[PDB]
N, CA, C and O atoms as a Maestro MAE file, in Angstrom:
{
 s_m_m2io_version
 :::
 2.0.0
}

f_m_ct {
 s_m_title
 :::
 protein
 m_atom[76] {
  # First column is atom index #
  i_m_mmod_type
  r_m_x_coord
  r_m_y_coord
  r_m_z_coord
  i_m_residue_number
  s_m_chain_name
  s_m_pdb_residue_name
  s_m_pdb_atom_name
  i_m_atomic_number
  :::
  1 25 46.458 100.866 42.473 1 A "UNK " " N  " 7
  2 3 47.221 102.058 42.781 1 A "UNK " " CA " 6
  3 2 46.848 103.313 42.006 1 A "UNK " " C  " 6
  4 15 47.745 103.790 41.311 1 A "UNK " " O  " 8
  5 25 45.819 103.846 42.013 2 A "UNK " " N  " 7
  6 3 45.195 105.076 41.798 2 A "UNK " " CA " 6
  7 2 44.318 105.617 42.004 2 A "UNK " " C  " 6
  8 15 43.160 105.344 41.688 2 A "UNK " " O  " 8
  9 25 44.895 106.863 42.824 3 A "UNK " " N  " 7
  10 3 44.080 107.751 43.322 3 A "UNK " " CA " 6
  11 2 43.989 107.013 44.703 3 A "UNK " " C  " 6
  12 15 44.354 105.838 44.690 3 A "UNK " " O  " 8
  13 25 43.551 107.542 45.902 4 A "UNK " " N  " 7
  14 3 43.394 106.990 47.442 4 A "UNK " " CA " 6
  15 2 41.958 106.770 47.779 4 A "UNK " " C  " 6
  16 15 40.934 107.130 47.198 4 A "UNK " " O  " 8
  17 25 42.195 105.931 49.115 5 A "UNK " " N  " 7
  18 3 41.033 105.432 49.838 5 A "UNK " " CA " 6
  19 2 41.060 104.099 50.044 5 A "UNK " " C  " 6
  20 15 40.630 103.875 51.175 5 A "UNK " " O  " 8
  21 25 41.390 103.027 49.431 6 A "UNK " " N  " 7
  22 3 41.602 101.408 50.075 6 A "UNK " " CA " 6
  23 2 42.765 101.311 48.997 6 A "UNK " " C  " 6
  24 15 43.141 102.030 48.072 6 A "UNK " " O  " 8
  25 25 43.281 99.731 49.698 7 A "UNK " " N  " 7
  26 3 43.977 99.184 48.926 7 A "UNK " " CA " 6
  27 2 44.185 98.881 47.431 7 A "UNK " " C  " 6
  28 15 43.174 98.431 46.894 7 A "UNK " " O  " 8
  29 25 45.281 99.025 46.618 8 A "UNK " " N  " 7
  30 3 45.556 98.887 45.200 8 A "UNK " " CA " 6
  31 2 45.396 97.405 45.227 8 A "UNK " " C  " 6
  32 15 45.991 96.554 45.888 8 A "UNK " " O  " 8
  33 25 44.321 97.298 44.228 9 A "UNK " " N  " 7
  34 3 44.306 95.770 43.526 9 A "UNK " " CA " 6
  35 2 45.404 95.190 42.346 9 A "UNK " " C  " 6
  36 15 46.053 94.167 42.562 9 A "UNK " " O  " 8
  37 25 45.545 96.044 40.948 10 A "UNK " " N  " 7
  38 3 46.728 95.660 40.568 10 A "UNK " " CA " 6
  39 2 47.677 96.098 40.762 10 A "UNK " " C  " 6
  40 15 48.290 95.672 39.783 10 A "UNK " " O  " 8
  41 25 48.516 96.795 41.414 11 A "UNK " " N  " 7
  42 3 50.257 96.967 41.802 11 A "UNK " " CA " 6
  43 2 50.498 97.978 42.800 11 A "UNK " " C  " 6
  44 15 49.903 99.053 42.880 11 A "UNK " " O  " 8
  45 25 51.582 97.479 43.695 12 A "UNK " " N  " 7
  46 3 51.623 98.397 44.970 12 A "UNK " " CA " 6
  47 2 52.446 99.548 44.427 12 A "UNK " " C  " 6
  48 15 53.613 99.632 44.043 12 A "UNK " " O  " 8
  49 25 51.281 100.542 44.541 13 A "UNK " " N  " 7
  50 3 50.884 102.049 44.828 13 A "UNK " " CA " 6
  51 2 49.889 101.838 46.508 13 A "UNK " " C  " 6
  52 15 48.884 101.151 46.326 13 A "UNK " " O  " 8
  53 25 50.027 102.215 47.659 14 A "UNK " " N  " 7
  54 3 49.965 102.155 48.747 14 A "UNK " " CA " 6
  55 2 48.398 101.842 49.423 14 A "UNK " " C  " 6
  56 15 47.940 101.216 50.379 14 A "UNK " " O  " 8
  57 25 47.774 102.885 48.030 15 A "UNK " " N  " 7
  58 3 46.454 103.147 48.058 15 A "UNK " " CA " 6
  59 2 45.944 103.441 46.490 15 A "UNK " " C  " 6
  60 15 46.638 103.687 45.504 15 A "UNK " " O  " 8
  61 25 44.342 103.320 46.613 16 A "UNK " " N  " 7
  62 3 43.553 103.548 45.087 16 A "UNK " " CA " 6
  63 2 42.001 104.025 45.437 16 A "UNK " " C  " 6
  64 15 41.357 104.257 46.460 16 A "UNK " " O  " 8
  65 25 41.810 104.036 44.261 17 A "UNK " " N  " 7
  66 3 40.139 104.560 44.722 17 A "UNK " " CA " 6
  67 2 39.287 102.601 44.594 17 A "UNK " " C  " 6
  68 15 39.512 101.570 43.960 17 A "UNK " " O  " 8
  69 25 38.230 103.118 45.707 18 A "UNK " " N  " 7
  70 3 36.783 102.137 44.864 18 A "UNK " " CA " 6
  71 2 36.761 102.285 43.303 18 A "UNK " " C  " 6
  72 15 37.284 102.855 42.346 18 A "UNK " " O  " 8
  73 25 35.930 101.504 43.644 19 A "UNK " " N  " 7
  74 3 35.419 100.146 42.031 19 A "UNK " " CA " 6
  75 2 34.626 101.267 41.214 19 A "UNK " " C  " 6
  76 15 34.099 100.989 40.137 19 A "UNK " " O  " 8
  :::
 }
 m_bond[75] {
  # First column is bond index #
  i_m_from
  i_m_to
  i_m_order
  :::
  1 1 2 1
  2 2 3 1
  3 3 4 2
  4 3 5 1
  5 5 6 1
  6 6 7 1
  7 7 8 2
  8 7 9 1
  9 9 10 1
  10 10 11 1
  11 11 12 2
  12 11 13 1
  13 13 14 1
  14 14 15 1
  15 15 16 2
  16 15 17 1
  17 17 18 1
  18 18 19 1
  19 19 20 2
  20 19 21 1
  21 21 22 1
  22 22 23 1
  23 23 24 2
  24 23 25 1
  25 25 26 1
  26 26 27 1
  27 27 28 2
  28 27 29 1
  29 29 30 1
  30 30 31 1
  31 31 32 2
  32 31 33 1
  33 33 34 1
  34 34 35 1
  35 35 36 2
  36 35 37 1
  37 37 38 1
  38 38 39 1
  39 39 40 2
  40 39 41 1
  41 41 42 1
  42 42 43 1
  43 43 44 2
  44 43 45 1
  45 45 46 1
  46 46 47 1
  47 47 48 2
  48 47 49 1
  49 49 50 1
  50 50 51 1
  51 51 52 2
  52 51 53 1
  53 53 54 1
  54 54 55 1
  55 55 56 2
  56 55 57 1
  57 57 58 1
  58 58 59 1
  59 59 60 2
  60 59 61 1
  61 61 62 1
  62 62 63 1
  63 63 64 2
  64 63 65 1
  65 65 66 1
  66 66 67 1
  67 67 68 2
  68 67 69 1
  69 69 70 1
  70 70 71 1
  71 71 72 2
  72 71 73 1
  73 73 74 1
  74 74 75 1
  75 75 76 2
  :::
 }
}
């Protein structure tokens, strides 16, 4: 959950950035 563009890996925030 940070920052947008795919799914949050550790905790729902909706969206996150790439790796």
């Amino acid at each position: 959950g940070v920052g947008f563009g795919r799914p949050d890996s550790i905790l729902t925030q909706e969206q996150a950035k790439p790796m």
